[PDB]
Structure formats: structure tokens, C-alpha cells
Amino acid sequence: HHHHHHMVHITLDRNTANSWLIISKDRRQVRMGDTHQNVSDNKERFSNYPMVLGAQRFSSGKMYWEVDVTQKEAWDLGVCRDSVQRKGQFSLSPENGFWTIWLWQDSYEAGTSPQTTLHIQVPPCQIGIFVDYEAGVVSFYNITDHGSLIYTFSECVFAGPLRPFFNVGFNYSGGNAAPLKLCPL
Ligand SMILES: O=C(c1ccc2c(c1)OCO2)N1CCCCCC1
């Protein structure tokens, strides 16, 4: 692709984080801790899942950023509405305000309803995310495989400001402790 010139500097918003996440001092990395990270509860925090939002809000233009997923067994990435549900159980779908892909149990899926199988020959270590607000497009790229297309959501109905969206996943296995990292420009 040729989206790199719309690069934006994303930082994580600690106030949205599940109370078990550890966000680095530079707000560019997040991982699972061993326990409750000693923060107060608030209505922004994702309660059921190890999710966090970027601080930036987007309502126009073209935006691009990259995320490192090296050695993780499970994660979700993409964008979501600023007004998504934070508490209780929910599915990642456009109907619920999410435009995401994920890894789970050695398969990659797009968060459509129902979910769509992705065809990835080279397991990605870094994912590029492109948003075109006006066109209603969210696209995912495999940076490990020369930027090859993973998935495009088109005809998106954003219906509000968008925030970068992250899920570090469960670590029931002991094999998914590695962080998500926002890669330098
Ligand atoms: O992966 C998780 C986990 C993370 C966030 C959660 C959660 C579970 O439920 C609500 O938000 N853990 C922690 C507890 C069990 C042992 C390790 C796995």
C-alpha cells in the first residue's frame, strides 16, 4: 500500500483500560498484569475483557498506524465508536460500533456478524490499520508480508467519532503475556 504518509502518533488512554492492564510510561505499550493494577473504577473502563482505547478521536480524514503483535496467541485490533458499551458482555461487530480483526486459536477472523475467515499465509508480527472517515473504509495490512492486504471493511457507518481499539487478550495459557506495542513512524 501507499498509506504510510497518513501516519498518526497514537497513545493509549489509561482511564479506558480494564483494571488489570499495565500501560507503559510513554503510553505506547500495554500488557496483562498478574492482578488488579490498583486503580479506581470508572464508567469508561472495559469490565469484562482486557481492552483499552487510544486517546485520539477521529471524525474526518485519513489515518494510519501500526501495532506489534509479536509472540501473542490472542488479540483484537481496529477502531470503534467513542460511545461503545464498556460494561458487560458484547460481540465485536459493526452493529455494536466496532471495526476489528483478531487472532484466536491459530485462526485470524474479521469482526463481522457473523465473523469472516481471513486467509493469512505469513503470520503477522506487525499490523497496519488504515481509516478513511469520509469514504467509510477500515483496512488492515500485514507489515511482515510486504504490506499485503488482510481485510477491508467498506460502506462503514461510523455514526460518531472513532477511537483506536485494542484487546491484549486472555492469558489463561501462560503463552499470551506479550504486549501490544504502537510502532514508531
Ligand atoms: O486473561 C485473564 C483475564 C484478563 C482480563 C479479564 C479477565 C480475565 O476477566 C475479566 O477481565 N486472566 C486473569 C484471570 C485468570 C488467570 C489468567 C488470565
UniProtKB/Swiss-Prot annotation:
Encoding gene (name)? Trim21
| Record's subcellular location | Cytoplasm; Cytoplasmic vesicle, Autophagosome; Nucleus; Cytoplasm, P-body
Determine the domain of life of the protein's source.
Eukaryota
**Under which name does UniProt file this protein?**
E3 ubiquitin-protein ligase TRIM21
Query: Which part of the chain is the B30.2/SPRY domain?
Result: 8-185
What is the purpose of this protein? E3 ubiquitin-protein ligase whose activity is dependent on E2 enzymes, UBE2D1, UBE2D2, UBE2E1 and UBE2E2. Forms a ubiquitin ligase complex in cooperation with the E2 UBE2D2 that is used not only for the ubiquitination of USP4 and IKBKB but also for its self-ubiquitination. Component of cullin-RING-based SCF (SKP1-CUL1-F-box protein) E3 ubiquitin-protein ligase complexes such as SCF(SKP2)-like complexes. A TRIM21-containing SCF(SKP2)-like complex is shown to mediate ubiquitination of CDKN1B ('Thr-187' phosphorylated-form), thereby promoting its degradation by the proteasome.
**What causes induction of this gene?**
Up-regulated by IFN.
Q: What does the PTM comment state? A: Autoubiquitinated; does not lead to its proteasomal degradation. Deubiquitinated by USP4; leading to its stabilization. Autoubiquitinated.
Subunit record text: Homotrimer. Component of a SCF(SKP2)-like complex containing CUL1, SKP1, TRIM21 and SKP2. Interacts with CALR, CUL1, FBXW11, HSPA5, IKBKB, IRF3, SKP1 and VCP. Interacts with SKP2; the interaction with SKP2 does not depend on an intact F-box domain. Interacts (via N-terminus and C-terminus) with DCP2 (via N-terminus and C-terminus). Interacts (via C-terminus) with IRF8 (via C-terminus). Interacts with ULK1, BECN1 and with ATG8 family members, including GABARAP, GABARAPL1, GABARAPL2 and MAP1LC3C/LC3C. Interacts with TRIM21 and SQSTM1/sequestosome 1. Interacts with IRF3.
The record's comment on protein family reads:
Belongs to the TRIM/RBCC family.
